[PDB]
Design a protein around this nucleic acid. Structure first.
Lengths: 175, 119, 59, 137, 47, 94, 82
RNA sequence: UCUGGUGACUAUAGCAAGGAGGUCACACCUGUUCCCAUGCCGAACACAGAAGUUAAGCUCCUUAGCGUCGAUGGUAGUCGAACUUACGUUCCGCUAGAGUAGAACGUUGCCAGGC
RNA sequence: UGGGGCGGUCGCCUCCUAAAAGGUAACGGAGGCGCUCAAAGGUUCCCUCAGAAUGGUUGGAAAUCAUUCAUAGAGUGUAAA
RNA sequence: GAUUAUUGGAGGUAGAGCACUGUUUGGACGAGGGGCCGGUUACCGAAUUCAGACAAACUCCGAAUGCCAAUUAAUUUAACU
């Protein structure tokens, strides 16, 4: 809760000047993040999906479980089964560690415009911004990789919308 | 835009989903339970008519310690079982509510079971 | 924390040569290259970091 | 009006004849309306004829609102052939009306002009009918 | 999805019948059920 | 503005009710402000004349019995065929 | 006569006699039927078995009471007062 | 007198909204530390602390705004009867749906506290 | 068999005709069947809608994922109920 | 056994009615395609409302009348094996 404590001070200095809570038993927050990776078209690319797995096994403290295709949609031959996703959900102390890590080690390999973005919030209070996966993994950088992916990383927030995430990012965010 | 709620409502939804078949006839009268946060409360109740039969708890301080959040449940399971020793000292039907045969539940369960009662 | 699909996590001391940002995370609970206690005993060789040092918002 | 243009069933039943207009009994779209007195079938070829006459007399004047689509088919075999080894192809489409049912409206045109056009429409038409103004008061 | 007429452990004749398939259930199956010479649910096996 | 009606009664059968509606009058039934579920009949002619005098709405002190009180349309069962009314529903406004 | 051709759709089912068999106030037997249905239009209540095909029987002998079940559904309540 | 449950009454019982309420419980809460624990979370559950809280959840109050039912009479529609031959007439009753006044923001048995 | 007639069809299940109990015709209207699940079965303990927009690597909008409503519109092995 | 006053119930007809399913959008509605370079504007897929109209195989509603059975009551004379 390193930067969480900074914006905790801002709950009383800024978002008591902004959100104006009636009790300290009521405050804002993010909840967590769901980090479902992408397609990983394992029709026979099961090993590619295993590489996408072992990426986030360690690049992320939690690893995914595959979203198997409940359906048989065209545009890629999915059927009942068809492991074609990822279920990462970073909740607590890992969530804060990833915060204090990634706000700082993303932009070195993001080449961002503002530093994170002007904006790419999808509109439900979250980014879900497709990544080129370079800014991520300073631990396993783009030296030995095998596959690019872009993920709809969903900011699972008590933020009612994206505007709250904006002024929330005093935490090394350039909104 | 993504939030949380009370838990007792879902407790009681499961409770209703079970209540159908497990029904105190006022002879195996319905022994319903409530573990809220701190102390667990209990009552066997004539429910074929919908009227009291007993009343006990862990906030009911006659059987009271600072044991576990659990051994106190065992105490109340002995105690209300003694309030049933007079009558209803037999096997009746408990209610697992939206709760489970483990924990507070099971400690109290076998407390009642072995405080004279035919469960 | 999807225990069942959760490998290790930790607050890693990913110290840099610039700004010493050893307040990071990863899966490599590293050796005591920086055998320190102000930050964890993790490898401080990860120097390339601009979001605090040389970023588009502040070079 | 309001629809996607599919169908549901083909050889529906030869429908009701009698009764009364359940609705469509007031002048809404246009101002100069026509309703009916009789209660019989319509093929829309008579109304094809009718609106032809109407327009070519109106000289591309005011507007028109038909209050109909023939929702329902009718069939026929060829002429006076033997009976009951099937039910023939649809020979067209219909929607019977009843008295009290508004059927046409127009606006952006003169009153007696409308009267004339409606007379002309009825003349190619199998049903006794009547013109009205905006049902008000 | 075809038939199976089983032989009991020792109940000694042709009584019990069911459905299975040699694709879902390609191998000889066996399970518990009441036979009459025993007054109990015993195991019986496929032949 | 001060039109007059008359007071209906029970079991207006298929015969007498058709007769009255066929006549130059028609049944109304009022309720609402200081009023009960009360049935009456009204001359079509002057009813329509007051339509022409005051329009779709007019605070009318309706003279039945001894009282001329503010009541207006709740609704009405009217036949566009034959251009006269079968039924009218009334609501007091005071 | 002449050519009349192939012809298909005269296919329907030899029916079944469903619904009720006994009524309000009526007195019954033990294996007595009270209804032949499919699904649950009505819901067995007191002293009522439900066989496989949604057939209902009264577990006892006695007399019947249909009634509401929910706020908008219906059931049975057999009573063997005597 | 508020509570908990377990209750019977269908929401005109309520939906939504406003305000108060206060760790008699309540939930907020800190974690995994153990039983437990999550094919994919201490989320949940369980366990463990009760530190703190009505702000939430929460009960009460205010609107009937939403819903809800819903009158009055009336309508056809139908019963039969009699007509005549009408895409019908008439008596007779049964009287719908729909509209609509209008309404109501609960009764309530239950033990123990709370009292 | 609306003369024999060629054609066809001939055994079961769903609906509509069917007329508010049930029941009922037509060389009358529309549709399924000649099975399948050792797990889709039995039994305990959890879950709870598609879909819609919301929207964003994806993007042929949409896949996966995510916010909120959705009437079970989900869906349920085999048509319709 | 019967008839009728008294019942009590079942049920989805007629009628109503769009609330689902949907049949023919008048209107606008904002966009997507599009005329254009990714756009302009048309119109639409579609949906937004407003908006109405229709239904053997549509139903949130819903009669009369008939069906079943009641100390059912009374007046008859059946009724059953």
């Amino acid at each position: 809760n390193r930067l969480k404590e900074k914006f905790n001070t801002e709950v009383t200095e800024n978002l008591m000047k902004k959100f104006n809570y009636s009790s300290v038993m009521e405050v804002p927050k993010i909840d967590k993040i769901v980090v479902n990776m992408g397609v990983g078209d394992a029709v026979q690319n099961s090993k590619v999906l295993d590489n996408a797995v072992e990426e986030l096994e360690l690049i992320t403290g939690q690893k995914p479980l595959v979203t198997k295709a409940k359906k048989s949609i065209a545009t890629f031959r999915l059927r009942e089964g068809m492991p074609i996703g990822a279920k990462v959900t970073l909740r607590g102390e890992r969530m804060y560690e990833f915060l204090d890590k990634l706000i700082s080690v993303s932009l070195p390999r993001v080449r961002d415009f503002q530093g994170v973005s002007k904006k790419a919030f999808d509109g439900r209070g979250n980014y879900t911004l497709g990544v080129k996966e370079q800014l991520i993994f300073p631990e396993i950088d783009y030296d030995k990789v095998s596959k690019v992916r872009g993920m709809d990383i969903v900011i699972v927030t008590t933020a009612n919308t994206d505007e709250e995430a904006r002024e929330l990012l005093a935490n090394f965010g350039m909104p | 835009m993504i939030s949380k709620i009370d838990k007792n409502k879902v407790r009681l939804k499961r409770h209703a989903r079970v209540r159908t078949n497990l029904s105190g006839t006022a002879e195996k009268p319905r022994l319903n339970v409530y573990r809220s946060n701190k102390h667990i409360y209990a009552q066997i109740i004539d429910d074929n008519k919908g009227v009291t039969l007993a009343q006990a708890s862990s906030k009911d301080s006659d059987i009271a310690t600072t044991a576990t959040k659990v051994e106190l449940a065992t105490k109340v399971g002995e105690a209300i079982a003694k309030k049933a020793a007079d009558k209803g000292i037999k096997e009746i039907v408990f209610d697992r509510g939206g709760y489970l045969y483990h924990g507070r539940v099971k400690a109290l369960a076998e407390a009642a079971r072995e405080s004279g009662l035919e469960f | 924390m999807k225990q069942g699909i959760h490998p290790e996590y930790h607050q890693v001391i990913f110290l840099d040569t610039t700004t010493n940002f050893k307040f990071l995370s990863g899966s490599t609970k590293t050796s005591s290259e920086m055998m320190e206690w102000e930050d964890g005993k993790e490898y401080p060789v990860i120097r390339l970091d601009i979001s605090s040092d040389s970023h588009p918002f502040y070079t | 009006m309001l629809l996607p243009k599919r169908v549901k069933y083909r050889r529906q039943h030869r429908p009701k004849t009698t009764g009364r207009s359940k609705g469509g009994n007031y002048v809404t779209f246009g101002e100069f309306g026509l309703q009916a007195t009789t209660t019989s079938w319509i093929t829309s070829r008579q109304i094809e004829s009718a609106r032809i006459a109407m327009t070519r007399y109106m000289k591309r004047g005011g507007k028109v609102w038909i209050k109909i689509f023939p929702h329902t088919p009718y069939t026929k075999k060829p002429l006076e052939v033997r009976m009951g080894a099937g039910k023939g192809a649809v020979e067209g489409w219909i929607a019977v009306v009843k008295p009290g049912r508004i059927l046409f409206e127009v606006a952006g045109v003169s009153e007696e002009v409308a009267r004339e056009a409606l007379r002309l429409a009825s003349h190619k038409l199998p049903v006794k009918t009547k013109f009205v103004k905006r049902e008000e008061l | 999805r075809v038939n199976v007429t089983l032989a009991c452990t020792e109940c000694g004749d042709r009584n019990y019948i069911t459905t299975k398939n040699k694709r879902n259930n390609p191998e000889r199956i066996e399970m518990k059920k009441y036979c009459p010479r025993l007054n109990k649910y015993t195991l019986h096996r496929e032949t | 503005a001060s039109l007059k009606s008359i007071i209906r009664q029970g079991k207006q059968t298929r015969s007498d009710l058709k007769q009255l509606r066929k006549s130059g009058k028609v049944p109304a039934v009022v309720y609402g402000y200081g009023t009960k579920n009360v049935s009456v009949k009204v001359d079509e002619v002057e009813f329509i004349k007051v339509i022409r005098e005051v329009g779709r709405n007019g605070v009318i002190e309706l003279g039945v019995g001894s009282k001329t009180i503010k009541v207006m349309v709740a609704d009405y069962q009217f036949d566009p065929l034959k251009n006269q009314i079968t039924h009218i529903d009334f609501l007091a406004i005071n | 006569k002449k050519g009349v051709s192939s012809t298909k759709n005269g296919r329907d089912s030899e029916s079944k006699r469903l619904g009720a068999k006994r009524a309000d106030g009526q007195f019954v037997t033990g294996g007595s039927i009270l209804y032949r249905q499919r699904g649950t239009k009505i819901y067995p209540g007191e002293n009522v078995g439900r066989g496989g095909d949604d057939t209902l029987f009264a577990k006892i002998d006695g007399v019947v009471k249909f009634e509401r079940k929910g706020r908008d559904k219906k059931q049975v309540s057999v009573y063997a007062v005597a």
